[PDB]
């Protein structure tokens, strides 16, 4: 997260870290047994870390659960990153508490201008690399489809939304993928891709999760 702020500890209790030795992607807890992330974050083995704040220090309040199942959207396409959504089944259920909590799926698609909260442990520089120990947070609005399409001509499917600032300076970044964009208590976006980070006229592009509510509920109720 470039241009954001350090989140208060456990202030984003649906945020998880996906770990394959080290942190590499985010995700969101949607029920006690399942995390939603981006499909390009697939790895054959994934450890889900819940209740995290400092991913580099054991606070004694975290939960460490390996993935038992990892299911990428069947139509995921690594080249246009359409259908960039993934479900991870925890090998044992998460214990829900004030620091480990679910986030609601969307009741409905999110309108342009809706203010959102994006979070993650990704790069905090738009040039160079500075990876935080502590979870970062950014408030940012949903952008209209036309402005999103205008920013990335011929690249934004109907399964993608832009959230951010066309003037630059504030965006998600590498290491934030799979992480949540939550607006009015609803997970509306999944960090997916962008041209660099926090560049002018190149906002973040996010999976439009409201298109996936049927796939999500149903994939869970089969695996």
């Amino acid at each position: 997260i470039v241009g954001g702020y350090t989140c208060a500890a456990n202030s984003i209790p649906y945020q998880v870290s996906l770990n394959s030795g080290s942190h590499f992607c985010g995700g969101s807890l949607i029920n006690s047994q399942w995390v939603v992330s981006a499909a390009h974050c697939y790895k054959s083995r994934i450890q889900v870390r819940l209740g995290e704040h400092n991913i580099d220090v054991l606070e004694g309040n975290e939960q460490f659960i390996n993935a038992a199942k990892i299911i990428t959207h069947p139509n995921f396409n690594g080249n246009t990153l359409d259908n960039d959504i993934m479900l991870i089944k925890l090998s044992s259920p998460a214990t829900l508490n004030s620091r480990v909590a679910t986030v609601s799926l969307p009741r409905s698609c999110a309108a342009a201008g809706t203010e959102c909260l994006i979070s993650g442990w990704g790069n905090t520089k738009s040039s160079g690399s500075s990876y935080p120990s502590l979870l970062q947070c950014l408030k940012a609005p949903v952008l209209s489809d036309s402005s999103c399409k205008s920013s990335y001509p011929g690249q934004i499917t109907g399964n993608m939304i832009c959230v951010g600032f066309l003037e630059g300076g504030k965006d998600s970044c590498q290491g934030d993928s799979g992480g949540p964009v939550v607006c009015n208590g609803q997970l509306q976006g999944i960090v997916s891709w962008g041209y660099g980070c926090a560049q002018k006229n190149k906002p973040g592009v996010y999976t439009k999760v409201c298109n996936y509510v049927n796939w999500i509920q149903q994939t869970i109720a089969a695996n």
């Binding site: 942190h23 990704g122 790069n123 891709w193």
Partner: peptide, 30 residues
């Protein structure tokens, strides 16, 4: 664009499509 996954790299082929291996050994946009 470049997907926003964190990948430690030695050279560009370690990276997803649209990314290159950055000067600090992380994948990112050219």
């Amino acid at each position: 664009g470049c997907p926003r996954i964190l990948i430690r790299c030695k050279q560009d082929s370690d990276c997803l499509a649209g990314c290159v291996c950055g000067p600090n050994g992380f994948c990112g946009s050219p």
